[PDB]
Amino acid sequence: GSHMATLKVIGVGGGGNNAVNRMIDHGMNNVEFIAINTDGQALNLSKAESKIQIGEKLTRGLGAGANPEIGKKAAEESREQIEDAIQGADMVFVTSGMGGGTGTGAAPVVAKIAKEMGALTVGVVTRPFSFEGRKRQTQAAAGVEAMKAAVDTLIVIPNDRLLDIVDKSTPMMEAFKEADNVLRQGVQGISDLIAVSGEVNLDFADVKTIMSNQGSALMGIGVSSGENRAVEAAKKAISSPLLETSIVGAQGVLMNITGGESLSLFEAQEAADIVQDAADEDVNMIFGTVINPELQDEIVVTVIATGF
Ligand SMILES: Nc1nc2c(ncn2[C@@H]2O[C@H](COP(=O)(O)OP(=O)(O)O)[C@@H](O)[C@H]2O)c(=O)[nH]1
Ligand SMILES: [Ca+2]
Protein backbone atom coordinates (compact mmCIF):
# COMPACT_ATOMS: atom_id res chain seq x y z
CA GLY A 1 0.00 0.00 0.00
CA SER A 2 1.28 3.35 -1.22
CA HIS A 3 0.18 6.73 0.14
CA MET A 4 -1.05 9.52 -2.15
CA ALA A 5 -1.53 12.78 -0.28
CA THR A 6 -4.63 14.88 -0.93
CA LEU A 7 -3.61 18.49 -1.52
CA LYS A 8 -6.09 21.42 -1.45
CA VAL A 9 -5.49 25.12 -2.25
CA ILE A 10 -8.02 27.51 -0.69
CA GLY A 11 -8.32 31.16 -1.68
CA VAL A 12 -9.96 33.36 0.93
CA GLY A 13 -11.25 36.81 -0.06
CA GLY A 14 -10.55 38.82 -3.16
CA GLY A 15 -6.80 38.55 -3.60
CA GLY A 16 -6.76 34.90 -2.56
CA ASN A 17 -9.42 34.00 -5.10
CA ASN A 18 -7.69 35.85 -7.88
CA ALA A 19 -4.53 33.91 -7.05
CA VAL A 20 -6.59 30.73 -7.27
CA ASN A 21 -8.08 31.76 -10.62
CA ARG A 22 -4.66 32.52 -12.06
CA MET A 23 -3.26 29.22 -10.78
CA ILE A 24 -6.12 27.26 -12.38
CA ASP A 25 -5.43 29.04 -15.68
CA HIS A 26 -1.72 28.21 -15.41
CA GLY A 27 -2.63 24.54 -15.06
CA MET A 28 -2.35 22.30 -12.00
CA ASN A 29 -3.29 18.63 -11.68
CA ASN A 30 -4.04 16.50 -8.62
CA VAL A 31 -4.76 19.64 -6.57
CA GLU A 32 -8.29 20.57 -5.48
CA PHE A 33 -9.13 24.29 -5.57
CA ILE A 34 -11.59 25.90 -3.15
CA ALA A 35 -12.77 29.52 -3.41
CA ILE A 36 -14.13 31.17 -0.26
CA ASN A 37 -15.54 34.72 -0.29
CA THR A 38 -18.23 36.94 1.19
CA ASP A 39 -18.42 38.79 -2.14
CA GLY A 40 -20.94 36.88 -4.23
CA GLN A 41 -20.24 38.87 -7.40
CA ALA A 42 -16.57 37.88 -7.36
CA LEU A 43 -17.30 34.30 -6.35
CA ASN A 44 -19.54 33.99 -9.43
CA LEU A 45 -16.42 34.59 -11.55
CA SER A 46 -14.29 32.00 -9.74
CA LYS A 47 -12.83 29.15 -11.81
CA ALA A 48 -12.67 26.80 -8.81
CA GLU A 49 -14.81 23.66 -8.71
CA SER A 50 -15.71 24.26 -5.05
CA LYS A 51 -17.10 27.70 -4.21
CA ILE A 52 -18.19 28.68 -0.71
CA GLN A 53 -20.09 31.93 -0.09
CA ILE A 54 -19.65 32.83 3.56
CA GLY A 55 -21.53 35.32 5.67
CA GLU A 56 -24.48 35.98 3.34
CA LYS A 57 -26.81 36.83 6.23
CA LEU A 58 -24.19 39.24 7.57
CA THR A 59 -23.08 41.05 4.40
CA ARG A 60 -26.17 40.48 2.23
CA GLY A 61 -23.78 39.10 -0.41
CA LEU A 62 -21.28 41.95 -0.44
CA GLY A 63 -17.72 41.88 0.71
CA ALA A 64 -16.77 42.73 4.25
CA GLY A 65 -16.23 46.45 3.63
CA ALA A 66 -12.70 46.29 5.08
CA ASN A 67 -13.95 45.03 8.46
CA PRO A 68 -12.04 41.91 9.68
CA GLU A 69 -14.65 41.15 12.32
CA ILE A 70 -17.17 40.59 9.55
CA GLY A 71 -14.81 38.21 7.76
CA LYS A 72 -14.21 36.28 10.97
CA LYS A 73 -17.90 35.99 11.87
CA ALA A 74 -18.74 35.07 8.28
CA ALA A 75 -16.30 32.16 8.37
CA GLU A 76 -17.30 30.91 11.82
CA GLU A 77 -20.97 30.76 10.77
CA SER A 78 -20.06 28.78 7.63
CA ARG A 79 -17.77 26.41 9.57
CA GLU A 80 -19.78 23.35 8.61
CA GLN A 81 -19.57 24.25 4.93
CA ILE A 82 -15.81 24.90 5.25
CA GLU A 83 -15.27 21.54 7.00
CA ASP A 84 -17.22 19.73 4.27
CA ALA A 85 -15.00 21.37 1.66
CA ILE A 86 -11.76 20.44 3.43
CA GLN A 87 -12.79 16.88 4.22
CA GLY A 88 -10.21 14.35 3.08
CA ALA A 89 -7.33 16.84 2.92
CA ASP A 90 -3.83 15.75 3.92
CA MET A 91 -2.32 19.18 3.14
CA VAL A 92 -4.09 22.54 2.79
CA PHE A 93 -2.60 25.78 1.43
CA VAL A 94 -4.61 28.87 2.44
CA THR A 95 -3.87 31.98 0.37
CA SER A 96 -5.23 35.42 1.10
CA GLY A 97 -4.40 39.11 0.99
CA MET A 98 -4.20 40.57 4.50
CA GLY A 99 -5.58 44.03 5.26
CA GLY A 100 -9.18 43.79 4.05
CA GLY A 101 -12.12 42.34 5.86
CA THR A 102 -12.62 38.90 4.38
CA GLY A 103 -9.06 37.61 4.10
CA THR A 104 -7.87 39.14 7.35
CA GLY A 105 -10.75 37.77 9.37
CA ALA A 106 -11.76 34.58 7.57
CA ALA A 107 -8.38 33.14 6.49
CA PRO A 108 -7.26 32.30 10.07
CA VAL A 109 -10.62 30.60 10.73
CA VAL A 110 -10.24 28.53 7.53
CA ALA A 111 -6.68 27.57 8.46
CA LYS A 112 -7.71 26.64 12.02
CA ILE A 113 -10.44 24.36 10.70
CA ALA A 114 -7.98 22.63 8.35
CA LYS A 115 -5.46 22.04 11.13
CA GLU A 116 -8.10 20.77 13.56
CA MET A 117 -9.03 18.24 10.87
CA GLY A 118 -5.46 16.90 10.92
CA ALA A 119 -4.24 18.49 7.68
CA LEU A 120 -0.78 19.94 7.25
CA THR A 121 -1.72 23.59 6.91
CA VAL A 122 0.36 26.21 5.09
CA GLY A 123 -0.57 29.88 4.74
CA VAL A 124 0.72 32.10 1.93
CA VAL A 125 -0.47 35.65 2.51
CA THR A 126 0.35 39.19 1.39
CA ARG A 127 0.78 42.36 3.40
CA PRO A 128 -0.62 45.54 1.83
CA PHE A 129 1.35 48.18 -0.04
CA SER A 130 2.48 51.10 2.08
CA PHE A 131 0.49 53.33 -0.29
CA GLU A 132 -2.67 51.70 1.16
CA GLY A 133 -2.00 53.46 4.45
CA ARG A 134 -1.22 52.72 8.08
CA LYS A 135 -4.64 51.40 9.08
CA ARG A 136 -4.63 48.75 6.35
CA GLN A 137 -1.12 47.76 7.40
CA THR A 138 -2.14 47.49 11.06
CA GLN A 139 -5.21 45.39 10.24
CA ALA A 140 -3.02 43.21 8.05
CA ALA A 141 -0.49 42.70 10.85
CA ALA A 142 -3.23 41.44 13.15
CA GLY A 143 -4.29 39.04 10.41
CA VAL A 144 -0.73 37.79 9.98
CA GLU A 145 -0.46 37.10 13.71
CA ALA A 146 -3.81 35.27 13.69
CA MET A 147 -2.62 33.24 10.69
CA LYS A 148 0.59 32.32 12.52
CA ALA A 149 -1.47 30.97 15.39
CA ALA A 150 -3.63 28.85 13.07
CA VAL A 151 -1.20 27.30 10.55
CA ASP A 152 1.64 24.82 10.64
CA THR A 153 3.79 27.10 8.47
CA LEU A 154 3.40 30.63 7.08
CA ILE A 155 4.90 32.44 4.08
CA VAL A 156 4.36 36.22 4.04
CA ILE A 157 4.81 38.30 0.86
CA PRO A 158 4.94 42.06 1.56
CA ASN A 159 3.40 43.66 -1.51
CA ASP A 160 5.91 46.49 -1.20
CA ARG A 161 8.51 44.00 -2.41
CA LEU A 162 6.78 44.02 -5.79
CA LEU A 163 7.99 47.61 -6.15
CA ASP A 164 11.53 46.20 -6.12
CA ILE A 165 11.00 44.02 -9.19
CA VAL A 166 9.10 46.36 -11.54
CA ASP A 167 10.18 49.23 -13.71
CA LYS A 168 7.96 52.29 -14.05
CA SER A 169 5.92 50.61 -16.82
CA THR A 170 5.52 47.00 -15.62
CA PRO A 171 1.77 46.25 -15.62
CA MET A 172 0.29 45.69 -12.20
CA MET A 173 -1.10 42.32 -13.27
CA GLU A 174 2.38 41.19 -14.32
CA ALA A 175 3.73 42.12 -10.89
CA PHE A 176 0.88 40.16 -9.30
CA LYS A 177 1.81 37.08 -11.35
CA GLU A 178 5.31 37.23 -9.85
CA ALA A 179 3.84 37.06 -6.36
CA ASP A 180 1.56 34.18 -7.47
CA ASN A 181 4.67 32.16 -8.32
CA VAL A 182 5.59 31.73 -4.65
CA LEU A 183 2.51 29.65 -3.84
CA ARG A 184 2.21 27.97 -7.24
CA GLN A 185 5.80 26.69 -7.32
CA GLY A 186 5.67 25.63 -3.68
CA VAL A 187 2.56 23.53 -4.30
CA GLN A 188 4.05 22.07 -7.48
CA GLY A 189 7.28 21.23 -5.68
CA ILE A 190 5.36 19.14 -3.14
CA SER A 191 3.24 17.53 -5.86
CA ASP A 192 6.41 16.54 -7.74
CA LEU A 193 8.01 15.19 -4.57
CA ILE A 194 4.99 12.97 -3.85
CA ALA A 195 4.62 11.74 -7.43
CA VAL A 196 8.18 10.47 -8.09
CA SER A 197 10.21 7.83 -6.26
CA GLY A 198 13.67 9.37 -5.96
CA GLU A 199 17.00 7.59 -5.98
CA VAL A 200 17.33 9.15 -2.52
CA ASN A 201 13.65 9.37 -1.76
CA LEU A 202 11.72 12.02 0.14
CA ASP A 203 7.97 11.75 0.65
CA PHE A 204 5.02 13.39 2.34
CA ALA A 205 6.15 12.21 5.78
CA ASP A 206 9.38 14.23 5.29
CA VAL A 207 7.23 17.23 4.29
CA LYS A 208 5.24 16.81 7.50
CA THR A 209 8.40 16.59 9.58
CA ILE A 210 9.82 19.78 8.05
CA MET A 211 6.57 21.80 8.09
CA SER A 212 4.39 20.67 11.02
CA ASN A 213 4.05 23.27 13.81
CA GLN A 214 7.09 25.30 12.67
CA GLY A 215 6.07 28.96 12.15
CA SER A 216 7.68 30.91 9.35
CA ALA A 217 8.81 29.11 6.22
CA LEU A 218 10.51 29.53 2.87
CA MET A 219 9.57 27.45 -0.18
CA GLY A 220 11.61 27.91 -3.34
CA ILE A 221 12.77 26.31 -6.57
CA GLY A 222 15.73 27.03 -8.83
CA VAL A 223 16.58 25.71 -12.30
CA SER A 224 19.94 26.10 -14.03
CA SER A 225 22.13 24.57 -16.71
CA GLY A 226 25.74 24.65 -17.77
CA GLU A 227 28.75 25.45 -15.66
CA ASN A 228 28.14 25.87 -11.95
CA ARG A 229 24.52 24.82 -12.49
CA ALA A 230 24.05 23.30 -9.03
CA VAL A 231 25.28 26.37 -7.14
CA GLU A 232 23.23 28.63 -9.40
CA ALA A 233 20.05 26.59 -9.00
CA ALA A 234 20.51 26.44 -5.22
CA LYS A 235 21.04 30.21 -4.99
CA LYS A 236 17.89 30.74 -7.06
CA ALA A 237 15.86 28.43 -4.82
CA ILE A 238 16.67 30.41 -1.66
CA SER A 239 16.56 33.87 -3.27
CA SER A 240 13.79 35.79 -1.78
CA PRO A 241 13.20 39.24 -3.31
CA LEU A 242 9.48 38.99 -2.47
CA LEU A 243 9.71 37.23 0.89
CA GLU A 244 9.48 38.47 4.44
CA THR A 245 11.27 35.32 5.66
CA SER A 246 14.60 34.83 3.90
CA ILE A 247 16.77 31.71 4.23
CA VAL A 248 18.88 33.36 6.94
CA GLY A 249 18.40 31.58 10.26
CA ALA A 250 16.76 28.42 8.94
CA GLN A 251 17.47 25.42 11.12
CA GLY A 252 15.65 22.74 9.10
CA VAL A 253 15.74 22.29 5.32
CA LEU A 254 14.19 19.75 3.00
CA MET A 255 16.26 19.93 -0.20
CA ASN A 256 15.56 17.84 -3.28
CA ILE A 257 17.82 17.88 -6.34
CA THR A 258 16.55 16.60 -9.68
CA GLY A 259 18.89 16.12 -12.62
CA GLY A 260 19.73 13.85 -15.50
CA GLU A 261 22.19 10.97 -15.47
CA SER A 262 25.06 13.47 -15.25
CA LEU A 263 24.06 14.65 -11.75
CA SER A 264 27.32 14.47 -9.82
CA LEU A 265 27.95 13.75 -6.16
CA PHE A 266 30.21 16.78 -5.97
CA GLU A 267 27.60 19.19 -7.29
CA ALA A 268 24.97 17.78 -4.92
CA GLN A 269 27.29 18.63 -2.05
CA GLU A 270 27.89 22.08 -3.57
CA ALA A 271 24.17 22.78 -3.60
CA ALA A 272 23.67 21.50 -0.04
CA ASP A 273 26.54 23.71 1.14
CA ILE A 274 25.10 26.83 -0.55
CA VAL A 275 21.86 26.40 1.34
CA GLN A 276 23.49 25.79 4.71
CA ASP A 277 26.05 28.58 4.32
CA ALA A 278 23.28 31.07 3.50
CA ALA A 279 21.22 29.83 6.45
CA ASP A 280 24.29 30.52 8.62
CA GLU A 281 23.06 27.94 11.12
CA ASP A 282 23.65 24.28 11.89
CA VAL A 283 20.92 23.05 9.54
CA ASN A 284 19.12 19.73 9.99
CA MET A 285 18.85 18.71 6.34
CA ILE A 286 16.50 16.19 4.80
CA PHE A 287 18.18 15.56 1.46
CA GLY A 288 16.72 13.92 -1.63
CA THR A 289 17.75 13.19 -5.20
CA VAL A 290 15.77 12.29 -8.33
CA ILE A 291 17.37 11.20 -11.60
CA ASN A 292 15.13 12.22 -14.51
CA PRO A 293 16.81 11.03 -17.73
CA GLU A 294 14.60 13.34 -19.82
CA LEU A 295 16.66 16.17 -18.34
CA GLN A 296 19.93 16.69 -20.17
CA ASP A 297 21.98 19.51 -18.67
CA GLU A 298 19.27 21.04 -16.48
CA ILE A 299 19.33 20.74 -12.68
CA VAL A 300 16.41 21.66 -10.41
CA VAL A 301 16.82 22.38 -6.68
CA THR A 302 13.73 22.53 -4.43
CA VAL A 303 14.01 23.89 -0.88
CA ILE A 304 11.60 24.03 2.05
CA ALA A 305 13.15 25.84 5.00
CA THR A 306 11.72 26.17 8.53
CA GLY A 307 12.98 26.31 12.11
CA PHE A 308 13.44 30.08 12.36
N1 LIG B 1 -0.27 40.56 -4.57
C1 LIG B 1 -1.62 40.75 -4.58
N2 LIG B 1 -2.14 41.49 -3.60
C2 LIG B 1 -3.49 41.64 -3.62
C3 LIG B 1 -4.32 41.14 -4.71
N3 LIG B 1 -5.61 41.50 -4.46
C4 LIG B 1 -5.60 42.18 -3.30
N4 LIG B 1 -4.33 42.31 -2.85
C5 LIG B 1 -3.95 42.83 -1.54
O1 LIG B 1 -4.88 42.17 -0.61
C6 LIG B 1 -5.43 43.14 0.25
C7 LIG B 1 -6.87 42.74 0.57
O2 LIG B 1 -7.62 42.81 -0.62
P1 LIG B 1 -8.82 41.77 -0.82
O3 LIG B 1 -8.33 40.36 -0.78
O4 LIG B 1 -9.46 42.16 -2.09
O5 LIG B 1 -9.73 42.05 0.52
P2 LIG B 1 -10.93 41.15 1.12
O6 LIG B 1 -11.51 40.44 -0.03
O7 LIG B 1 -11.82 42.10 1.85
O8 LIG B 1 -10.29 40.18 2.07
C8 LIG B 1 -5.33 44.47 -0.48
O9 LIG B 1 -5.30 45.50 0.49
C9 LIG B 1 -4.04 44.29 -1.28
O10 LIG B 1 -2.85 44.63 -0.57
C10 LIG B 1 -3.67 40.35 -5.75
O11 LIG B 1 -4.28 39.85 -6.73
N5 LIG B 1 -2.35 40.23 -5.60
CA1 LIG C 1 9.30 11.07 -3.58
Side-chain angles (χ1 to χ4, degrees), residues 13-15 18 22 97-98 100-103 126 128-129 132 136 159 162 176 179:
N18 284 128
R22 295 194 287 267
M98 301 288 95
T102 297
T126 60
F129 295 99
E132 301 182 73
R136 200 91 168 175
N159 273 336
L162 292 175
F176 283 176

Side-chain angles (χ1 to χ4, degrees), residues 190-198 200-204 206 256 289-290:
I190 290 138
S191 296
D192 291 346
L193 212 73
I194 298 175
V196 195
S197 190
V200 179
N201 192 54
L202 305 176
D203 68 16
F204 186 63
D206 299 304
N256 189 77
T289 295
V290 176

Side-chain angles (χ1 to χ4, degrees), residues 94-114:
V94 181
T95 193
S96 190
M98 301 288 95
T102 297
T104 310
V109 177
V110 171
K112 169 194 70 185
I113 290 166

Side-chain angles (χ1 to χ4, degrees), residues 269-289:
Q269 175 172 239
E270 283 184 311
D273 286 346
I274 287 294
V275 177
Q276 294 170 85
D277 290 348
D280 199 30
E281 300 277 337
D282 290 334
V283 178
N284 181 14
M285 183 159 286
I286 303 182
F287 172 80
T289 295

Side-chain angles (χ1 to χ4, degrees), residues 64-72 100-102 105 139:
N67 187 349
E69 176 68 14
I70 297 302
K72 180 174 183 265
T102 297
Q139 275 193 178

